[PDB]
Ligand SMILES: CN(Cc1ccc(Cl)cc1)S(=O)(=O)c1ccc(S(N)(=O)=O)cc1
Protein backbone atom coordinates (compact mmCIF):
# COMPACT_ATOMS: atom_id res chain seq x y z
CA UNK A 1 0.00 0.00 0.00
CA UNK A 2 2.46 2.54 -1.37
CA UNK A 3 0.59 5.34 -3.19
CA UNK A 4 0.69 9.07 -4.03
CA UNK A 5 -0.49 9.85 -0.48
CA UNK A 6 0.62 6.71 1.45
CA UNK A 7 4.45 6.84 1.18
CA UNK A 8 6.69 6.12 4.18
CA UNK A 9 9.83 4.33 5.33
CA UNK A 10 8.38 0.87 5.92
CA UNK A 11 9.06 -2.12 3.70
CA UNK A 12 6.02 -1.72 1.43
CA UNK A 13 6.14 2.09 1.04
CA UNK A 14 9.76 3.08 1.70
CA UNK A 15 12.33 4.87 -0.48
CA UNK A 16 12.87 1.94 -2.96
CA UNK A 17 9.18 2.25 -3.86
CA UNK A 18 8.79 6.06 -4.11
CA UNK A 19 9.64 6.01 -7.82
CA UNK A 20 6.41 4.08 -8.44
CA UNK A 21 4.37 7.26 -7.75
CA UNK A 22 7.07 9.93 -7.99
CA UNK A 23 9.12 9.07 -11.11
CA UNK A 24 11.42 12.04 -10.44
CA UNK A 25 12.94 9.82 -7.70
CA UNK A 26 15.23 8.65 -10.51
CA UNK A 27 16.00 12.21 -11.71
CA UNK A 28 19.34 13.87 -12.21
CA UNK A 29 19.24 16.17 -9.18
CA UNK A 30 18.01 14.00 -6.38
CA UNK A 31 18.89 14.35 -2.71
CA UNK A 32 20.59 13.40 -0.49
CA UNK A 33 24.06 12.58 -1.70
CA UNK A 34 27.34 11.37 -0.36
CA UNK A 35 29.79 14.27 -0.07
CA UNK A 36 33.27 12.99 -1.01
CA UNK A 37 35.49 15.72 0.43
CA UNK A 38 38.45 15.06 -1.87
CA UNK A 39 36.11 15.89 -4.82
CA UNK A 40 34.68 19.10 -3.38
CA UNK A 41 35.19 22.30 -5.35
CA UNK A 42 36.54 24.89 -2.93
CA UNK A 43 34.96 28.04 -4.29
CA UNK A 44 36.25 31.47 -3.26
CA UNK A 45 33.14 33.23 -4.64
CA UNK A 46 30.78 31.66 -2.06
CA UNK A 47 29.74 34.24 0.57
CA UNK A 48 29.27 33.78 4.31
CA UNK A 49 25.86 32.57 5.44
CA UNK A 50 23.67 35.33 6.83
CA UNK A 51 21.06 33.91 9.25
CA UNK A 52 18.38 35.78 11.19
CA UNK A 53 15.78 33.75 13.17
CA UNK A 54 13.17 35.48 15.33
CA UNK A 55 12.24 33.13 18.21
CA UNK A 56 8.64 34.38 17.89
CA UNK A 57 8.31 32.99 14.29
CA UNK A 58 7.55 29.40 15.41
CA UNK A 59 3.84 28.68 15.77
CA UNK A 60 3.23 24.90 16.08
CA UNK A 61 4.87 21.51 16.26
CA UNK A 62 3.22 18.58 14.47
CA UNK A 63 3.61 14.86 13.84
CA UNK A 64 3.21 14.40 10.06
CA UNK A 65 3.64 10.61 10.26
CA UNK A 66 7.02 11.10 8.46
CA UNK A 67 8.78 13.39 11.01
CA UNK A 68 8.08 16.20 13.46
CA UNK A 69 7.47 19.58 11.82
CA UNK A 70 8.07 22.87 13.51
CA UNK A 71 6.11 25.36 11.41
CA UNK A 72 6.91 29.09 11.37
CA UNK A 73 4.91 32.12 10.34
CA UNK A 74 6.33 32.94 6.89
CA UNK A 75 4.16 36.01 6.12
CA UNK A 76 6.93 38.43 7.20
CA UNK A 77 10.72 38.69 6.80
CA UNK A 78 11.56 38.18 10.54
CA UNK A 79 13.30 34.84 9.97
CA UNK A 80 15.45 34.65 6.83
CA UNK A 81 18.47 33.06 5.23
CA UNK A 82 20.68 35.07 2.92
CA UNK A 83 24.18 34.86 1.47
CA UNK A 84 26.06 31.66 0.89
CA UNK A 85 25.34 30.50 -2.65
CA UNK A 86 21.95 32.26 -2.64
CA UNK A 87 20.63 35.26 -4.56
CA UNK A 88 18.19 37.31 -2.54
CA UNK A 89 16.25 36.41 0.55
CA UNK A 90 14.88 33.03 1.63
CA UNK A 91 12.12 32.98 4.24
CA UNK A 92 11.98 30.40 7.05
CA UNK A 93 9.07 27.98 6.79
CA UNK A 94 9.68 24.61 8.45
CA UNK A 95 12.08 22.46 10.49
CA UNK A 96 12.33 18.64 10.18
CA UNK A 97 14.55 15.88 11.66
CA UNK A 98 15.73 12.64 10.11
CA UNK A 99 17.14 9.71 12.04
CA UNK A 100 17.85 5.99 11.68
CA UNK A 101 17.07 2.82 13.65
CA UNK A 102 20.23 3.06 15.80
CA UNK A 103 22.68 5.82 16.77
CA UNK A 104 25.47 4.69 14.35
CA UNK A 105 23.53 5.99 11.28
CA UNK A 106 20.44 7.98 10.41
CA UNK A 107 21.62 11.08 8.60
CA UNK A 108 20.47 11.63 4.99
CA UNK A 109 23.73 13.11 3.73
CA UNK A 110 26.84 10.94 4.21
CA UNK A 111 30.35 12.46 4.36
CA UNK A 112 33.22 10.28 3.21
CA UNK A 113 31.33 7.06 3.97
CA UNK A 114 30.40 8.31 7.45
CA UNK A 115 26.78 8.58 8.61
CA UNK A 116 25.75 10.76 11.55
CA UNK A 117 23.02 9.78 14.04
CA UNK A 118 20.56 12.35 12.66
CA UNK A 119 20.14 15.43 10.48
CA UNK A 120 18.12 18.56 11.01
CA UNK A 121 16.62 20.31 7.96
CA UNK A 122 15.73 24.01 8.00
CA UNK A 123 13.44 24.72 4.99
CA UNK A 124 13.22 28.24 3.43
CA UNK A 125 11.68 29.67 0.27
CA UNK A 126 12.64 32.45 -2.09
CA UNK A 127 10.15 35.24 -1.24
CA UNK A 128 11.99 37.87 -3.36
CA UNK A 129 10.96 36.03 -6.57
CA UNK A 130 7.97 33.83 -5.74
CA UNK A 131 4.57 34.55 -4.21
CA UNK A 132 4.49 31.54 -1.89
CA UNK A 133 6.17 28.37 -0.68
CA UNK A 134 3.93 26.30 -2.99
CA UNK A 135 5.05 28.28 -6.11
CA UNK A 136 8.72 28.31 -5.00
CA UNK A 137 8.75 24.52 -4.45
CA UNK A 138 8.52 23.89 -8.24
CA UNK A 139 11.32 26.33 -9.26
CA UNK A 140 15.04 25.36 -9.47
CA UNK A 141 15.98 28.33 -7.30
CA UNK A 142 12.83 28.28 -5.14
CA UNK A 143 13.98 26.51 -1.96
CA UNK A 144 17.02 26.53 0.27
CA UNK A 145 17.45 23.83 2.92
CA UNK A 146 20.00 24.17 5.69
CA UNK A 147 21.22 20.75 6.89
CA UNK A 148 22.82 20.22 10.30
CA UNK A 149 24.23 16.86 11.36
CA UNK A 150 23.55 15.53 14.87
CA UNK A 151 26.18 13.34 16.51
CA UNK A 152 25.89 11.33 19.72
CA UNK A 153 27.47 13.27 22.56
CA UNK A 154 26.54 15.28 25.64
CA UNK A 155 22.81 15.97 25.96
CA UNK A 156 21.89 19.12 24.03
CA UNK A 157 19.54 21.28 26.10
CA UNK A 158 18.69 23.15 22.84
CA UNK A 159 16.92 19.99 21.70
CA UNK A 160 15.01 19.88 25.01
CA UNK A 161 12.23 22.32 24.03
CA UNK A 162 11.46 20.00 21.09
CA UNK A 163 11.84 16.66 22.94
CA UNK A 164 9.72 17.92 25.87
CA UNK A 165 6.81 18.15 23.38
CA UNK A 166 6.95 14.64 21.82
CA UNK A 167 4.30 12.97 24.08
CA UNK A 168 1.84 15.74 23.02
CA UNK A 169 2.20 14.68 19.40
CA UNK A 170 2.79 10.89 19.53
CA UNK A 171 0.01 10.05 17.06
CA UNK A 172 0.24 10.91 13.37
CA UNK A 173 -1.48 14.27 12.75
CA UNK A 174 -1.27 15.62 16.32
CA UNK A 175 -0.11 19.24 16.70
CA UNK A 176 0.68 21.55 19.60
CA UNK A 177 1.29 25.25 20.02
CA UNK A 178 5.06 25.80 19.94
CA UNK A 179 6.48 29.34 20.19
CA UNK A 180 9.49 31.31 21.47
CA UNK A 181 11.75 28.75 19.82
CA UNK A 182 15.38 29.88 19.55
CA UNK A 183 16.35 28.06 16.37
CA UNK A 184 19.49 30.13 15.81
CA UNK A 185 20.93 28.90 19.14
CA UNK A 186 20.44 25.30 17.96
CA UNK A 187 22.99 25.79 15.08
CA UNK A 188 26.66 24.92 15.60
CA UNK A 189 29.20 27.67 16.31
CA UNK A 190 30.71 27.56 12.79
CA UNK A 191 28.55 28.05 9.65
CA UNK A 192 31.15 26.63 7.19
CA UNK A 193 29.21 24.57 4.69
CA UNK A 194 28.96 22.50 1.53
CA UNK A 195 26.46 23.35 -1.19
CA UNK A 196 24.94 21.57 -4.20
CA UNK A 197 21.77 21.65 -6.32
CA UNK A 198 19.25 19.05 -5.34
CA UNK A 199 15.81 18.05 -4.29
CA UNK A 200 13.45 17.42 -1.44
CA UNK A 201 14.39 14.19 0.33
CA UNK A 202 10.75 13.19 0.76
CA UNK A 203 7.91 12.89 -1.79
CA UNK A 204 7.29 14.74 -3.97
CA UNK A 205 11.05 14.93 -4.34
CA UNK A 206 11.00 18.26 -6.29
CA UNK A 207 14.32 19.39 -7.77
CA UNK A 208 14.03 22.86 -6.33
CA UNK A 209 16.51 22.86 -3.46
CA UNK A 210 19.77 24.67 -2.97
CA UNK A 211 21.30 22.39 -0.26
CA UNK A 212 23.56 24.03 2.35
CA UNK A 213 25.01 21.34 4.61
CA UNK A 214 26.89 22.57 7.63
CA UNK A 215 30.26 20.94 8.17
CA UNK A 216 30.13 21.08 12.00
CA UNK A 217 27.73 18.68 13.81
CA UNK A 218 25.76 19.44 16.96
CA UNK A 219 25.12 17.02 19.80
CA UNK A 220 22.28 14.72 20.76
CA UNK A 221 22.28 12.12 23.56
CA UNK A 222 21.16 8.59 22.76
CA UNK A 223 18.20 8.96 25.17
CA UNK A 224 17.07 12.23 23.48
CA UNK A 225 17.39 10.58 20.03
CA UNK A 226 15.26 7.59 21.16
CA UNK A 227 12.35 9.96 21.97
CA UNK A 228 11.87 10.59 18.23
CA UNK A 229 11.54 6.84 17.48
CA UNK A 230 8.55 6.72 19.89
CA UNK A 231 6.62 8.93 17.49
CA UNK A 232 4.03 6.96 15.56
CA UNK A 233 3.74 6.95 11.78
CA UNK A 234 0.11 5.79 12.19
CA UNK A 235 -3.01 7.79 13.17
CA UNK A 236 -5.11 7.43 16.33
CA UNK A 237 -7.31 4.33 16.12
CA UNK A 238 -5.28 2.66 13.33
CA UNK A 239 -2.69 -0.10 13.92
CA UNK A 240 0.35 1.35 15.73
CA UNK A 241 3.77 1.52 14.06
CA UNK A 242 6.74 3.58 15.23
CA UNK A 243 8.71 6.03 13.14
CA UNK A 244 11.93 4.16 13.92
CA UNK A 245 13.70 5.49 10.81
CA UNK A 246 13.00 8.22 8.28
CA UNK A 247 16.03 8.84 6.08
CA UNK A 248 16.42 8.47 2.28
CA UNK A 249 19.58 6.81 0.98
CA UNK A 250 22.15 8.85 -0.96
CA UNK A 251 21.37 9.36 -4.65
CA UNK A 252 23.54 9.58 -7.82
CA UNK A 253 25.46 12.81 -8.38
CA UNK A 254 25.00 12.59 -12.16
CA UNK A 255 27.52 15.32 -12.98
CA UNK A 256 26.71 17.65 -10.09
CA UNK A 257 29.47 19.25 -8.11
CA UNK A 258 29.59 19.93 -4.41
CA UNK A 259 31.16 23.22 -3.50
CA UNK A 260 32.67 24.13 -0.15
CA UNK A 261 32.74 27.52 1.52
CA UNK A 262 35.81 26.64 3.59
C1 LIG B 1 8.33 20.66 0.85
N1 LIG B 1 7.10 20.05 1.39
C2 LIG B 1 6.63 19.02 0.45
C3 LIG B 1 5.76 19.79 -0.52
C4 LIG B 1 6.34 20.70 -1.41
C5 LIG B 1 5.54 21.42 -2.28
C6 LIG B 1 4.16 21.26 -2.25
CL1 LIG B 1 3.16 22.16 -3.33
C7 LIG B 1 3.57 20.37 -1.36
C8 LIG B 1 4.37 19.63 -0.50
S1 LIG B 1 7.33 19.47 2.91
O1 LIG B 1 6.86 20.44 3.94
O2 LIG B 1 6.58 18.17 3.06
C9 LIG B 1 9.02 19.19 3.00
C10 LIG B 1 9.93 20.20 2.75
C11 LIG B 1 11.30 19.93 2.80
C12 LIG B 1 11.72 18.63 3.07
S2 LIG B 1 13.40 18.19 3.18
N2 LIG B 1 13.37 17.09 4.39
O3 LIG B 1 14.03 17.60 1.96
O4 LIG B 1 14.23 19.40 3.47
C13 LIG B 1 10.79 17.64 3.35
C14 LIG B 1 9.44 17.91 3.28
Ligand SMILES: [Zn+2]
Pocket residue numbers: 096097098121201
Ligand atom coordinates in the same frame (compact mmCIF):
# COMPACT_ATOMS: atom_id res chain seq x y z
ZN1 LIG C 1 14.08 16.94 5.63
